[PDB]
Amino acid sequence: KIIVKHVTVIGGGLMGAGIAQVAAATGHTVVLVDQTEDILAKSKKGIEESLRKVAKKKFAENPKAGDECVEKTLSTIATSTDAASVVHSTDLVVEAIVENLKVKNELFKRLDKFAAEHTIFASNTSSLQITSIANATTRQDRFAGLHFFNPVPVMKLVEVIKTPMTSQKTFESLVDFSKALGKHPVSCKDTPGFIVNRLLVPYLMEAIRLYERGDASKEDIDTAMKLGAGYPMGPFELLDYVGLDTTKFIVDGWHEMDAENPLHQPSPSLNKLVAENKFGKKTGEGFYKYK
Amino acid sequence: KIIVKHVTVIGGGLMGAGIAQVAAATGHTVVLVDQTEDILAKSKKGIEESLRKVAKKKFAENPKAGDECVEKTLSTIATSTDAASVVHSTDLVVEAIVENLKVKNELFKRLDKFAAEHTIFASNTSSLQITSIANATTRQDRFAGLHFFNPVPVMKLVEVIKTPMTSQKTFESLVDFSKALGKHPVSCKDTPGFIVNRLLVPYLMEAIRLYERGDASKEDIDTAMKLGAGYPMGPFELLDYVGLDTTKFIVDGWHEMDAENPLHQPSPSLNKLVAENKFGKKTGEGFYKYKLE
Ligand SMILES: NC(=O)C1=CN([C@@H]2O[C@H](COP(=O)(O)OP(=O)(O)OC[C@H]3O[C@@H](n4cnc5c(N)ncnc54)[C@H](O)[C@@H]3O)[C@@H](O)[C@H]2O)C=CC1
Numbered sequence A: 001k002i003i004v005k006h007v008t009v010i011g012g013g014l015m016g017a018g019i020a021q022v023a024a025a026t027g028h029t030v031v032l033v034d035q036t037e038d039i040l041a042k043s044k045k046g047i048e049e050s051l052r053k054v055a056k057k058k059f060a061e062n063p064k065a066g067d068e069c070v071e072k073t074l075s076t077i078a079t080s081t082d083a084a085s086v087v088h089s090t091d092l093v094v095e096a097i098v099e100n101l102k103v104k105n106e107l108f109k110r111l112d113k114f115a116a117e118h119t120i121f122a123s124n125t126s127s128l129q130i131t132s133i134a135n136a137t138t139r140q141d142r143f144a145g146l147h148f149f150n151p152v153p154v155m156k157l158v159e160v161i162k163t164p165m166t167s168q169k170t171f172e173s174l175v176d177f178s179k180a181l182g183k184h185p186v187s188c189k190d191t192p193g194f195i196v197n198r199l200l201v202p203y204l205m206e207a208i209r210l211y212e213r214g215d216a217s218k219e220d221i222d223t224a225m226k227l228g229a230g231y232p233m234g235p236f237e238l239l240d241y242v243g244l245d246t247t248k249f250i251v252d253g254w255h256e257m258d259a260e261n262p263l264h265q266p267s268p269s270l271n272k273l274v275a276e277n278k279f280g281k282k283t284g285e286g287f288y289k290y291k
Numbered sequence B: 001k002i003i004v005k006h007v008t009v010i011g012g013g014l015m016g017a018g019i020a021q022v023a024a025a026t027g028h029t030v031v032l033v034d035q036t037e038d039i040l041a042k043s044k045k046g047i048e049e050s051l052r053k054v055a056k057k058k059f060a061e062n063p064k065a066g067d068e069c070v071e072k073t074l075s076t077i078a079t080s081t082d083a084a085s086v087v088h089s090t091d092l093v094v095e096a097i098v099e100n101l102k103v104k105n106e107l108f109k110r111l112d113k114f115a116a117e118h119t120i121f122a123s124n125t126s127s128l129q130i131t132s133i134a135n136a137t138t139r140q141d142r143f144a145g146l147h148f149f150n151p152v153p154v155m156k157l158v159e160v161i162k163t164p165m166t167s168q169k170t171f172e173s174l175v176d177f178s179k180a181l182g183k184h185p186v187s188c189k190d191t192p193g194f195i196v197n198r199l200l201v202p203y204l205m206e207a208i209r210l211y212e213r214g215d216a217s218k219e220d221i222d223t224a225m226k227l228g229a230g231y232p233m234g235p236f237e238l239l240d241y242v243g244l245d246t247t248k249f250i251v252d253g254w255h256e257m258d259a260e261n262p263l264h265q266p267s268p269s270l271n272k273l274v275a276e277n278k279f280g281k282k283t284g285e286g287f288y289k290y291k292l293e
């Protein structure tokens, strides 16, 4: 097997930046790739701010060390706008770009030609068949899914998705990498939603339908699941937290893929909110109003 | 508005005993009912041990204070083998007996004749229609669902279920009663599973199906839902904790009422474990094996 040490993270967004941060914090050499220097500048600025917010609490008694820890970590992250020039000798590519299949395949189709031989390709996609991306390359045995959770530097869970073509050597290498990141890896096949979303999303939809049906108020439903099932957030609070458009996107995906299943049936309420651009906390309004 | 002060709890099992315990601990006069004096003696004993357990943890700094507390609560809990003998002067009847429609209807049909005019009737049932049970009486305006969660003394939620016939006054009085118990009441129509089970159970079934399908292990699924969704228990640990039989029962009912619905298709693994009489922590084994206490 291979020991991941040099990591190429493509996409410096919410997830990408988090992945690059944890990898660098855990002693991996990292190259963050995005489209423009400005995007990268902002992504790396965000990483630094996050690292400092932590350090100020952990190195309160010794601020010098705190600053070093931060510097050392940032210096271990490099940036580039050209993935091709970076993967020649990288051990792992973790892609977290726009959730679009075409764009993704083109990206990997191209990288497969420049990446080293031992290089492993992994996607952090939520609503896309890992296999539907692996096939865009001739490296399916070194291709898998590595699904993280927001906020990456906080959430310890990582889903290691193995396709029917993924090597066992590749799998274990990702399992070892996950642990080196200080994460707790779980295994799942390349099935829609993998584990978490597959069981969480349809339940969130069910909560909306119960409400749309007029069986109870959103407030009581949230209170019920928090006090009755011990959940951290009620379904509607959580829905606004993960983004209503983000959810709709995943459900429609499963609806088209299987318009017969009652769990993926569209929701008038959900659609309306998204329509009128009310996506949740990231807009100040979803099922509830914030800020 | 008549404020519930005297409560008759019918059924001294897991749920009724807890309801009785909480009502008694919050200043309500209580009468616990069950088939025999032994069952009752044992139920009340389980309530004492539960009280003494919390006492030795709340009154560590003064064991005597704890003793007084426990004794006071325990004393406000009378016991009777026939509820008909005390409902003529009770404000609320909370039933928590075997989950069987006919047995429940028979019970309430008879009590309807002894209960004071103002007395409210409430069932803690998880799978039966409150309306079905209410129509066993001629007191539907004073009939409703009052659904608790195990362990009752700990779970703060209570679902107040209103049938199309339940009166606003009956509803409000149960809402006030819930708060008086120190619980947080939520409202729901008389629909299958009300709020919690309707959203929880189908999810547990999906968990089993994902596993049976072989997409992931039970262990990984539990880890994933705990770390990924922040749940206190993975679905399989929760299934064993609430009872596999208890779960299968609720689902067969929904499947029965709508056999074409995919959400209620039975689970081979679930039926098998239940068939092997492996009901979870109850029997020392469910999806996981537990250390026989
Ligand atoms: N939003 C979430 O909480 C989670 C999302 N995901 C998945 O992670 C991926 C990342 O989504 P987010 O970080 O939230 O989105 P984001 O939009 O915040 O970040 C994506 C980044 O990708 C860049 N990008 C787009 N196309 C590119 C290309 N061809 N080459 C290089 N960079 C490109 C964008 O400039 C942007 O900075 C998606 O595949 C999504 O399904 C996975 C788990 C959780």
Ligand SMILES: NC(=O)C1=CN([C@@H]2O[C@H](COP(=O)(O)OP(=O)(O)OC[C@H]3O[C@@H](n4cnc5c(N)ncnc54)[C@H](O)[C@@H]3O)[C@@H](O)[C@H]2O)C=CC1
Binding pocket: B010, B011, B012, B013, B014, B015, B016, B033, B034, B035, B039, B095, B096, B097, B098, B099, B100, B103, B107, B124, B125, B126, B127, B147, B148, B149, B150, B242, B246
């Ligand atoms: N077990 C659970 O977690 C939950 C159960 N429930 C519901 O609450 C009810 C209570 O169930 P559990 O406490 O679990 O069962 P249980 O079997 O532990 O207790 C039921 C008690 O009812 C008594 N009983 C049966 N027929 C009777 C009659 N005619 N008169 C008086 N007592 C009679 C039994 O002797 C027994 O002590 C059921 O309807 C159930 O669906 C509701 C919420 C949660």
